[PDB]
Design a protein around this ligand. Structure first.
Ligand SMILES: CN(C)[C@@H]1C(O)=C(C(N)=O)C(=O)[C@@]2(O)C(O)=C3C(=O)c4c(O)cccc4[C@@](C)(O)[C@H]3[C@H](O)[C@@H]12
Ligand SMILES: CN(C)[C@@H]1C(O)=C(C(N)=O)C(=O)[C@@]2(O)C(O)=C3C(=O)c4c(O)cccc4[C@@](C)(O)[C@H]3[C@H](O)[C@@H]12
Ligand SMILES: [Cl-]
Ligand SMILES: [Cl-]
Ligand SMILES: [Cl-]
Ligand SMILES: [Cl-]
Ligand SMILES: [Cl-]
Ligand SMILES: [Cl-]
Ligand SMILES: [Mg+2]
Ligand SMILES: [Mg+2]
Lengths: 207, 207
């Protein structure tokens, strides 16, 4: 089929979503595209470069809340941004995984520069604003990956017996099995944001 | 070589550390152990079960701060525990990755029940204590994985040019390249803990 960049990335994203990073091989990508491997190689040579492109594409498609509304508080922006980031990463198998360790792409520079400047306009130093952004990002990535991977491993095996569990752990596992992860995510997100705030508002005060 | 459980797990952990989850194959594990694949299969059949065992072993070996000191505050316990968890996960290639989505093993029940009870003795409901524990865990996992994966991909390719970057992003990348991730981790950890505290101390007050 067609092998422009958009279509190669579209096929790789479809494949990722089917069988994850491990199934994103030259043979399988070549097969989905109905081409031979040396044909594929002309268009994409390097798995990390493909993964990097997929990480960028996932957010282009489904990360809706990348910039603050006019007059929006930093707290509200980080909340809305985090929910959006989470939703985008949950949209594909291994979506969070593809993101890990990437750095912003040139297609994202204007957006992420605006995010950083926005933080600094709300009183953060660049460094403290980056710490807040990194913490929200890391929290969100971790939450998504644990959610995704746990669900994936139900398929590779049953959990365990209910029998030998101690009681608080038994209830905690019930609490966790009763939701997809969003409730715990939202709770932790607020705790994170409030701690950033206490830190920002302290200035040079002991806090 | 010897194929008791301890030795199979020891070889799989060595292999994980060399080439990660992708290199942890039956051929490669069989090779490290100097055995044939059907020999290996008698001892370990299921990759997820092996990964699960490795996630448990990593913490047994190197997660030193799994329980509170007598009289230790919950805040201090979560801080010390998180630093320890992070150090244990950083100790092997893909260590954080192997952890993702696991649930506590029976060998860990007494310890993790104690952690949960400890939280509830310090005023958290089981659910809110679990939210705090999950948030700290998710934050820590995300931070470690981003650190590890970024470093891994320097080897698969150079980053980019310095030229076209906007200025705040340029400085932010300098800030990040100047540390391994520990400074941002510690800062975010304190923000997290303080937000848990504001939440706990509020009780039924609007906060
Ligand atoms: C989740 N959210 C907080 C951000 C975000 O919404 C975006 C995005 N493209 O809209 C990121 O790229 C964002 O998710 C993200 O991935 C970022 C980073 O990776 C990052 C980095 O690794 C080094 C320097 C700067 C950054 C940033 C500023 O681009 C962040 C960025 O703020 C993150
Ligand atoms: C990092 N730290 C906060 C904890 C920890 O130090 C340990 C450990 N074995 O010492 C966990 O297993 C710990 O890291 C960890 O992984 C936990 C969980 O995965 C978990 C879970 O998935 C479902 C229910 C309960 C749990 C817990 C309580 O076992 C947590 C546990 O509190 C986490
Ligand atoms: Cl074409
Ligand atoms: Cl789509
Ligand atoms: Cl607002
Ligand atoms: Cl033996
Ligand atoms: Cl060791
Ligand atoms: Cl203390
Ligand atoms: Mg990122
Ligand atoms: Mg866990």
């Amino acid at each position: 089929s067609r092998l422009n960049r958009e279509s190669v990335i579209d096929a790789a994203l479809e494949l990722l979503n089917e069988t994850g990073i491990d199934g994103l091989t030259t043979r399988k990508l070549a097969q989905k595209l109905g081409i031979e491997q040396p044909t594929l190689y002309w268009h994409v040579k390097n798995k990390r470069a493909l993964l990097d492109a997929l990480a960028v594409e996932i957010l282009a498609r489904h990360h809706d809340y990348s910039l603050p509304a006019a007059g929006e508080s930093w707290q509200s922006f980080l909340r809305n941004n985090a929910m959006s980031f989470r939703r985008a990463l949950l949209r594909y198998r291994d979506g969070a995984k593809v993101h890990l360790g990437t750095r912003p792409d040139e297609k994202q520079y204007d957006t992420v520069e605006t995010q950083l400047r926005f933080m600094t306009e709300n009183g953060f130093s660049l460094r403290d604003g980056l710490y807040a952004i990194s913490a929200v990002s890391h929290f969100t990535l971790g939450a998504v990956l644990e959610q995704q991977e746990h669900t994936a491993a139900l398929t590779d095996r049953p959990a365990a017996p209910d029998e030998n569990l101690p009681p608080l752990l038994r209830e905690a596992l019930q609490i966790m099995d009763s939701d997809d992860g969003e409730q715990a995510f939202l709770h932790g997100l607020e705790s994170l944001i409030r701690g950033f705030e206490v830190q920002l508002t302290a200035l040079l005060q002991i806090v």
